[PDB]
Write a protein that binds this DNA or RNA. Structure first.
Ligand SMILES: Nc1ccn([C@H]2C[C@H](O)[C@@H](COP(=O)(O)NP(=O)(O)OP(=O)(O)O)O2)c(=O)n1
Ligand SMILES: [Mg+2]
Ligand SMILES: [Mg+2]
Length: 430
DNA sequence: ATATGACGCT
DNA sequence: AGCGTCAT
């Protein structure tokens, strides 16, 4: 009734860079612009593994994780850029630096939560309120929203995409109740205006295009973002949720893409997000737990409370490399030399981090994977990180894992290791 | 034989 | 502390 909270208290956006690693390489190398192209790492095995794909190459069926040799069969004109390789491993510094370019521009507009190397959530609630007094009941021109889609519109009584976009926007803006400064729909619209400006600034100042979702929480914003990629933004209002969720496969909602989402489908015998509404909160808690049940009950009604955390810096700094198949490390010397390669890159990045961001890591986490174990980590151990010194860090890492070696011979390492992973954590101000 | 990062559970 | 889930 009147006491039902509707999850319309915030304006939250999720910005995601379109094929981000490709854009970085394309800005640097104009010959790659506006062409089917992909970013590859390690040219030797099958041409290297593809980790980013331009939208031109996506039209041929090229995808992430594909071998480049196989992508060329689908797309013979595919152009490739290689990831930097340092100390025998992929080095992502160029993309980290490009990411900082984007995050700093976004930070001028509102509070940012860095969600990945190329995505950030944005809490626009405060900026919207401020803009609502500076605007003074002025109606919002469609010209302030030139790349915005209104999910669910047009409805009711044009055969080209831009024509549909405009008609839905016009239908949205004509219905808009501008005098009520507390209309959630008006707030979202103002949020979208600000995101148009933020996205124009990113493009003007870096050359990078991105997509965005604008809604009332993080889950809807993230979902909204992908509805109209690339170089577009989508507003998902509270009212759009029943129709949108009615055919929305459960696995598309953030955090339901894995085992939990699969057991929702199997235990309840449903396919789409909106079908969750027919169960009571207690029923959902009995099947999935107190916290998963509460979360699902509200989320299938468009409601979610996870805050945009004010954090632009990662909380851990990590270095890892896999050694698949025949390349698995099988002698003590190999294990030690690779720990040293990881420790050396880690020291470089930590020292950079200590000068840029006034903090030091205090704990080193060492993670390995053993041959035949299909888990991400076979084993995790920690030690103190007191000195940004690569030889000390690699030696201590070796110390805390060496007893895992079941080999009778000193030369050897068994079982062979298919991953080494060094992660600096537990930062303190400095 | 596809490098990372955030976080929950116990 | 150490392992498990989910994600880009
Ligand atoms: N599994 C993954 C996913 C992404 N990435 C990297 C490469 C991507 O350019 C970058 C951004 O990830 P992403 O947003 O999921 N995809 P990308 O930005 O390339 O394309 P879009 O679909 O977002 O337009 O992280 C990775 O290295 N391994
Ligand atoms: Mg992206
Ligand atoms: Mg992303």
């Amino acid at each position: 009734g009147p006491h039902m909270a509707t999850g319309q208290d915030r304006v939250v956006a999720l910005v995601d860079m379109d094929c981000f690693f490709v854009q970085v390489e394309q800005r640097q190398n104009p010959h790659l612009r506006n062409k089917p192209c992909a970013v590859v790492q390690y040219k030797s095995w099958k041409g290297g593994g593809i980790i980013a794909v331009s939208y031109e190459a996506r039209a041929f069926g090229v995808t992430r994780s594909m071998w480049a040799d196989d992508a060329k069969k689908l797309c013979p004109d595919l152009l490739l850029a290689q990831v930097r390789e340092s100390r025998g491993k992929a080095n992502l510094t160029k993309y980290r630096e490009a990411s900082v370019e984007v995050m700093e521009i976004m930070s001028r507009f509102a509070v940012i939560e860095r969600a990945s190397i190329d995505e950030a959530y944005v809490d626009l609630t405060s900026a919207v309120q401020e803009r609502l007094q500076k605007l003074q009941g002025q109606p919002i021109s469609a010209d302030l929203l030139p790349s915005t889609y209104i999910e669910g519109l047009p409805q009711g009584p044009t055969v080209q995409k831009e024509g549909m976009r405009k008609q839905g926007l016009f239908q949205w803006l004509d219905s808009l109740q501008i005098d009520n400064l507390t209309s959630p729909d008006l707030q979202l619209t103002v949020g979208a205006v600000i995101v148009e400006e933020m996205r124009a600034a990113i493009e003007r100042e870096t050359g990078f295009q991105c997509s965005a979702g604008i809604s009332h929480n993080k889950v809807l914003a993230k979902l909204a973002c992908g509805l109209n990629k690339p170089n577009r933004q989508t507003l998902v209002s509270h009212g759009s949720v029943p129709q949108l969720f009615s055919q929305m496969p459960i696995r598309k909602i953030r955090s339901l893409g894995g085992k939990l989402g699969a057991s929702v489908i199997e235990i309840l015998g449903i396919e789409y997000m909106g079908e969750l509404t027919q169960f009571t909160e207690s029923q959902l808690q009995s099947h999935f737990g107190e916290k998963n049940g509460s979360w699902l009950y509200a989320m299938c009604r468009g409601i979610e409370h996870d805050p945009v955390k004010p954090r632009q810096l990662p909380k851990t700094i990590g270095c890892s490399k896999n050694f698949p198949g025949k390349t698995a490390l099988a002698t003590r010397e190999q294990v030690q030399w690779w720990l040293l390669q990881l420790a050396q890159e880690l020291e470089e990045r930590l020292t950079k981090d200590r000068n840029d961001n006034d903090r030091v890591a205090t704990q080193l986490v060492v993670s390995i994977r053993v041959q035949g174990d299909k888990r991400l980590s076979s084993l995790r151990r920690c030690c103190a990180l007191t000195r940004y010194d690569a030889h000390k860090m690699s030696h201590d890492a070796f110390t805390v894992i060496k007893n895992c070696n079941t080999s009778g011979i000193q030369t050897e390492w068994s079982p062979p290791l298919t991953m080494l992973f060094l992660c600096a954590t537990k930062f303190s101000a400095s």
